[PDB]
Ligand binder design. Sequence first.
Ligand SMILES: Nc1ncnc2c1ncn2[C@@H]1O[C@H](COP(=O)(O)OC(=O)c2ccccc2)[C@@H](O)[C@H]1O
Ligand SMILES: [Mg+2]
Length: 535
Amino acid sequence: SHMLDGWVPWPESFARRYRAAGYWEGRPLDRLLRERAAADPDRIALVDAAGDRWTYAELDRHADRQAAGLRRLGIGAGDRVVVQLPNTDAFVVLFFALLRAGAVPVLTLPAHRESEIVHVAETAGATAYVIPDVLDGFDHRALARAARKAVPSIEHVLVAGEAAEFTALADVDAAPVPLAEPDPGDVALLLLSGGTTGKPKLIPRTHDDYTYNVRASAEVCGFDSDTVYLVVLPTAHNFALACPGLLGTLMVGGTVVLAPTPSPEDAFELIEREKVTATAVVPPVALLWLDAVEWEDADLSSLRLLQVGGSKLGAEPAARVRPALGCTLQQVFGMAEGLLNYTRLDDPSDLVIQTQGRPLSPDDEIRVVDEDGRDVAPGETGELLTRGPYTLRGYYRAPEHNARTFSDDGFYRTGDLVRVLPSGHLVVEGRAKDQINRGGDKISAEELENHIMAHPGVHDAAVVGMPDATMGERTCACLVPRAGRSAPAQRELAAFLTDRGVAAYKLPDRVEVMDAFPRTSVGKTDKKELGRRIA
Ligand SMILES: Nc1ncnc2c1ncn2[C@@H]1O[C@H](COP(=O)(O)OC(=O)c2ccccc2)[C@@H](O)[C@H]1O
Ligand SMILES: [Mg+2]
């Protein structure tokens, strides 16, 4: 019996291998803090952007108090809680308090709006929603009111700030209570995938596979008690949470330092002030920092490791990382679904510059296949399929999408196009999935098309990616105007999408209007040819 239904557990044969190999160590996710705080209670665990800092024993205690307060509210074993918080200490405490209460965090980003939040809350049948009050000029409590009208299961709303009619997250606090450990083979959290279908999809990560993700990534990244990790991406991003992210920093006893934004203004000062040794960024932020050192005077010398992932860093800026930033580059080809590829920190610089890494686990299995599903010859380009000790066997409550996306023997189809080199390192060559990668931000084309076509002037919509030198891809919305009406232009369509509740990173960069969409045989919209007609 598993505490949650709607997910697809590993076959018992694989489970026994991964336990025998020491990958699945049988420990709840919250135990990495409990254990580090018992051994190093007085070490500084967490620093925020203001300079406020907390020990391991203070983090562990506060998480115990907030787990107790959550239970006084009825948020307990197996309930799903949508979490949408900025890079604050409030997120870190709530993450471990939800785990210790038995609740399942459903992690969303600050940029997500009503469309994403309502669907994610509905799919998970979430019983609570955790928000800030106002962030980047948006009042998230308005969003929480709209979410509660569409999703009746939401009983509580916890606000990191002025809670209005809702519950203040700071008041969720009570004397610690003995709370039962969860089964380590159960789902610990739900991640939001970037998406390839009309509706976002949630990824269950179990305690055993996510601990191993964190533990093995910290080993390969040299994370130790002397690591000062700067959280530049959102705390809810798998990359900054667990690869090794903040959980890996806390697992080994380093210091987590929270950045409010990735701008040099904020990031470079925290690196100088806190003596940050490691961080992780997307390539657009990499290029910015690579530029900004020529007019910023911050001392960044404590930097030892810059991870760059989410999209492919080019070889020319990759080669600039050591001269400009004085640190080692690690390319990270990962996914919230599982498989992580890392360059090794002592790889020859050729491989750190030209490749996106090699798999994290000895039991990560890699297949590269052609259109006919057939394995390619060595060193040819095909679609990557993967199976392993921390890669999901199925999305959460998405059986139709599961039947298209995983092979009969359990291989997850990444939708990425790759080459495997003789050393085992991968080179990302492109994408088979219909998903735009806008500076690391993933845009499901089908989701956005369903949004655009709901506009009264749009009949059909085909969303196509465009190369961009600094963003990697931008978004073009190709529109067939509704019969005898005028399709909207770029600013009006963007305004319609915002009020419909679409995250701002999914707003099209460009609008193209045409009479019909190029079609292949079988009658599907040819977006390879649109990529040409719109050029
Ligand atoms: N270094 C890279 N080069 C080229 N493409 C990369 C890449 N890293 C991710 N990708 C692409 O993002 C997809 C997964 O994105 P996701 O938002 O779930 O998480 C990371 O994006 C993510 C999660 C954990 C660690 C790192 C990135 C991958 O399938 C791939 O298409
Ligand atoms: Mg340095």
